Every structure is written in structure tokens, then in C-alpha cells.
Amino acid sequence: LVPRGSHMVGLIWAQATSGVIGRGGDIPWRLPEDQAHFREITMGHTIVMGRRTWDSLPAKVRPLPGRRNVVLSRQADFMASGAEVVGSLEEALTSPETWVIGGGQVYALALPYATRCEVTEVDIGLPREAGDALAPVLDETWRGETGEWRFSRSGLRYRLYSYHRS
Ligand SMILES: NC(=O)c1ccc[n+]([C@@H]2O[C@H](COP(=O)([O-])OP(=O)(O)OC[C@H]3O[C@@H](n4cnc5c(N)ncnc54)[C@H](OP(=O)(O)O)[C@@H]3O)[C@@H](O)[C@H]2O)c1
Ligand SMILES: CCc1nc(N)nc(N)c1OCCCOc1ccccc1C[C@H](C)C(=O)O
């Protein structure tokens, strides 16, 4: 029951405790439970990603189903079969609800407009290295709930944070 007419911009990411979210063009862990959670949050909404995050999805899974896929690139002729390609965030955020799904550069671009963050914290020890993609560091305007730790089937421990701001 949200009145029509507004544009909710959310960020969603999964990070190691160190803040690492990406390395070698991939996510350096596998957490099917987090993929299910990611699908549930974003389903039915527009999803915006950087060109490198588009490249990081296997060809056989993209575009992600049930969502309008939007890819941010400076290459006007970039080929993202089944997605919209835009050259700035100006016209990427026009839906009633948009989820920015990564990666490092696009989170920083969209953070100023975001009022929700859905964060998965993965208890993996990965100290930051040169070239890693990192999560945004939220400031004090954000408030939210910290979920309980839970074990994935692989035995990796993780928890969900749901943050909001006005
Ligand atoms: N939750 C997670 O853990 C998570 C989620 C998503 C992604 N990732 C990972 O994060 C890493 C990718 O993140 P990243 O920071 O390296 O790249 P990215 O943010 O996904 O995409 C970067 C690209 O976006 C375009 N871009 C950036 N700023 C732009 C601007 N102002 N205007 C127009 N286009 C702009 C450029 O594309 P062009 O070069 O084509 O011009 C830039 O190369 C990968 O390792 C991925 O696996 C992790
Ligand atoms: C589930 C990862 C994730 N998790 C969270 N919490 N936030 C995010 N932005 C986020 O990234 C979504 C974009 C990258 O997707 C992936 C990368 C590497 C392996 C597996 C997937 C999942 C597949 C491709 C799928 O969803 O179909």
C-alpha cells in the first residue's frame, strides 16, 4: 500500500565482512540461499547494473527473468541481448521501484538516490586486494534491522541487513 507516483531506488549486494563484493570479474563465493533472496527482493522490478556486472552473468542466465534489465555503459553500441543499455542513471531510475544490483562503480553512482539497501553479509575472511570491487560504506542517515546469522548448506555463515532512509 504505497501511493502511486514515486520512484523507489534500492541497492542490493552481498559482501564479505571486509566489504569485498567482487574479484576477478566474479563474486568470490557461492551462496544459493543469497541468490534466492536476491531474486525475491528484485522480482517484478527494474534492475540496473554496470556493464561489468552484465558481463559477469553467464550468457545462459541473462537477461534475468521477470525483471526489466538495464545496463549502464559508455559504449553506445554495447550489445546486451534482452536488456536496455543506457549511458547515465538519469533515465534508468524511472520505474516505481528500481533495484541497483551492482557492481562497485554503479553502487556509488546510485547511492545518492537510494532509500533502501538490502545487504547480505557473508562471514568469509577475504581481506581487500588491489582491483577488488567494494561495497558502499553507508553513512549515519541509514537505519535498519540486522538479521540472525544462518548457515548455508555449504556451511558458510551469512546474515541479512535491511536498511531504509527517508
Ligand atoms: N553483490 C555482489 O557481491 C555483487 C553484485 C554485482 C556485481 N558484483 C561483482 O562486482 C564486480 C563488478 O563491479 P565493477 O565496479 O568492477 O563494474 P560495474 O559497476 O558492474 O560496471 C562498471 C561499468 O559500468 C559503466 N559505468 C561506470 N560508471 C559509468 C558512468 N558514470 N556512466 C556510464 N557508464 C558508467 C562502465 O561501463 P563501460 O566500460 O562499458 O563503459 C563501467 O566500466 C564484479 O566482480 C561482479 O562479480 C558483485
Ligand atoms: C546472487 C548474487 C547477488 N546477491 C545479492 N544479495 N545482491 C546482488 N546484487 C547480487 O548480484 C546479482 C548480480 C550477479 O549475479 C551472480 C553473480 C555470480 C554468481 C551468481 C549470480 C546470481 C545469478 C546470475 C542470478 O541471480 O540469476
Side-chain angles (χ1 to χ4, degrees), residues 3-59 61-149 151-166:
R4 312 318 299 156
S6 53
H7 308 269
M8 200 287 295
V9 175
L11 313 183
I12 180 165
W13 73 85
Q15 62 171 87
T17 309
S18 62
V20 173
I21 67 168
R23 175 173 298 174
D26 197 1
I27 298 181
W29 60 84
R30 281 308 178 264
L31 204 55
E33 293 85 351
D34 171 67
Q35 183 173 323
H37 158 78
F38 166 83
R39 191 186 56 238
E40 181 201 351
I41 295 300
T42 59
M43 183 52 58
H45 307 296
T46 294
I47 55 177
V48 175
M49 73 204 86
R51 189 270 300 171
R52 298 196 177 279
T53 294
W54 177 262
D55 288 340
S56 77
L57 314 171
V61 308
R62 68 193 188 190
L64 296 183
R67 286 151 285 185
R68 180 164 71 98
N69 287 45
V70 174
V71 180
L72 179 69
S73 174
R74 295 193 188 80
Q75 320 175 47
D77 68 336
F78 184 73
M79 190 154 219
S81 299
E84 173 177 345
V85 172
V86 300
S88 71
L89 279 196
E90 181 180 346
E91 307 298 331
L93 308 178
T94 69
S95 312
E97 172 161 349
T98 303
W99 285 92
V100 172
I101 72 165
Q105 297 179 202
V106 182
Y107 293 134
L109 212 58
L111 184 52
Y113 313 102
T115 50
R116 289 187 55 185
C117 289
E118 293 287 335
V119 182
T120 300
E121 184 182 4
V122 186
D123 187 14
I124 189 170
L126 301 185
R128 304 163 169 198
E129 303 178 1
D132 288 357
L134 311 176
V137 171
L138 299 182
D139 59 49
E140 66 189 351
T141 65
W142 291 91
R143 66 248 184 196
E145 53 162 4
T146 300
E148 296 309 299
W149 285 117
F151 280 136
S152 72
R153 289 202 58 189
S154 72
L156 280 178
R157 181 168 86 154
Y158 70 101
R159 56 178 172 190
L160 304 180
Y161 295 84
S162 179
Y163 297 99
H164 306 247
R165 62 167 174 181
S166 304

